[PDB]
RNA sequence: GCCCCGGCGAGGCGCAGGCAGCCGUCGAACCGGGGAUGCCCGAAUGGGACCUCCCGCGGCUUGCCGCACUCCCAGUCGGG
RNA sequence: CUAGUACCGUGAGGGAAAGCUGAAAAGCACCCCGGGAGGGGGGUGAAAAGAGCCUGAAACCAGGCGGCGAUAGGAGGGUGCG
């Protein structure tokens, strides 16, 4: 998950990944309350990368 | 393993000598001395009967150093006279460890003979009171040490 | 039954997550150097300022 | 009389509150001002010259 | 340096020496040249001449 | 780097609180006399996969590989120098790369082989 | 500075650069954590008329100072208060001491 | 903490000596430079603040732009 | 040094204390006692320096050792002897 792959696609794919990633985060902290620790951070800076270059397009 | 006090013992051989301590206890430093005063140079188990005998307040120990306005006790040689439980239990406790630890280094009880015992002022735990016209008065706690050495008669 | 405005609520809440003890493995990691911090606090010997 | 009796009347409601812009419980809740940095009757910053408040707050020297 | 802190002194009657004090919860002398932390009495000086 | 100031505050707070693009270099070996005549080269900067010959201390004469690096503590382990616990458990004694000397290097990235062409 | 060295050696001077060294110590006191550690010993001192090398061929020759006519002053031959050091002059540093006297 | 251009060249995840695990040879961490995101109050400015929170009117298409006071140029559009 | 911090005052304002194990955590395996803090054996280390950790003074407390000690009068010392 990587700008290399990222900057390849449209925006509709995107959104939808971002959709995606949101339910997969909000299900992971729910099961987090009762292994590998850091699925959360990586989600969080996945969502980011696919903000910043989905602006990046929609700006030029 | 991790003690961290010496004591004020002189000539330990550990062939015919075992040693104890209690750390850190809450009780009255001056009684401490009073009673162990008593114990010194006595046997165990002779020590351990006085004890009891001090707990069920059968026998009272005399005081000669810190007696303000104590009351005499019936018999012969009593003027001052008193009776520390919470003392007796404590020092109680640390005889039966002496008597341990002779027994399992090789020595023989019916021979033991309390040939030091010293108590030691510790360190103090600061409270504070309050007192009228707005004023707050310590109100503290002072520990004791105590350490005993044990020697085996031939 | 007992009236408060909203932003007071919070900052109360805000007060209340403060107020616990240094966790174990922080001092476990630091070597026992960090025990505590300077916002312990109960509610009968400190006041906040509402 | 005048002393520890009196002290049991501070249960009413109090004379100042937090400042949205100031942040401290100097906010004069009655006259609509704050004590402190002047919010509510200037909207410039309360500032004496002979107040050490200010340099405090930045580790100046006086 | 060592003119820092307020201080009130108390005066004649207290059992105590007429010193200027701090007055919050320690209340320790303060600002004068025998008390801890205070101003020192002849400091150097950069006025002073050494050529 | 750049370090051109006499008072020792500074330069120790440097070393205290340097960057880590500079720690590499601070922590650099020596070569052997094969080495250093082959390509050419006194000193570099110590890596995981080398091969290290121990000069200062109580292990010393030990040959061993090099298993890690802490730029933070300025240290290396090295294979072999270790000592036992309590218990039992083998732990390695961490070394000064200063202490030293490496035998056979590992030349793996080409980085390396710039850094000595530059340098030589 | 090894020709420096070798010229040294045979005048006689050598002797007293290594004096120099070895009468180099580690001080006493606080001033270690200033800096100013290592108090330095003196040694010789060449009077030159004009500098063309020597001043970087035997700077770093410990306890050794070079210095022109022109700017003399009594730091450099009475250290300490205590006059008569070891000095090497030259000719033309004679000849501009007959010319300015001083 | 997100992106890009350069440097350095293998380790990295703040003060902070831990557990479990992730990132990095597609060149990271770090350093110089340039961008993005940037909640509420606050000159605080669409209107109100005894609690850093509330209540709106137009236009477009649920999301976006405009809407304070004292003035200049204009003029019922706008630009400062 | 988690300092204009903790804390004091309705407010204007006032304002502390707190540095150091060791070259390396090698930060004490295992045994007996104790309800437990812990004690005693054993170990690591060149040195316990044991985290209540560099050195570790005085006042003060306890014990041991030496001298004196229940018919006796001076600010606690000075001279001469036993
Ligand atoms: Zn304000």
Redesign the interface.
Known sequence: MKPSEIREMSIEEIDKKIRELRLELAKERGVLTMENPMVIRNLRRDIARLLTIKREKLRE | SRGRFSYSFQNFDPERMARASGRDLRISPKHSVELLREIRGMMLNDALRYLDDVIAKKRPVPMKRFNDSQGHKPGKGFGPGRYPVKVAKAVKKILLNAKNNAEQKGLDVDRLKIIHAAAHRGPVLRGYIPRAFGRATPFNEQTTHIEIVVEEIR | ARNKPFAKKL?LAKAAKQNRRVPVWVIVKTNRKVITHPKRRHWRRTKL?? | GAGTAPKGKRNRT?TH??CRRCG??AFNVKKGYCAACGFGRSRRMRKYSWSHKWRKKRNLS? | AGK?RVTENIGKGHGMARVERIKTSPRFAAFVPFAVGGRRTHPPKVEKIIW | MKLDMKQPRKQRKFLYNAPLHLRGKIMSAPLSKELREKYGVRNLPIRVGDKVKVMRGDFKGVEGKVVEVDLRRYRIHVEGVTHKKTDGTEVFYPLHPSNVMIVELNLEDEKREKIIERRA | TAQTREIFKKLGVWDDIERAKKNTKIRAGKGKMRGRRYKKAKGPLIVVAKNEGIVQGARNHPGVDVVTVDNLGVEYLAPGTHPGRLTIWTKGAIERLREIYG
């Open positions: 900052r300022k509402e | 109090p509150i937090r401290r419980r006086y | 820092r």
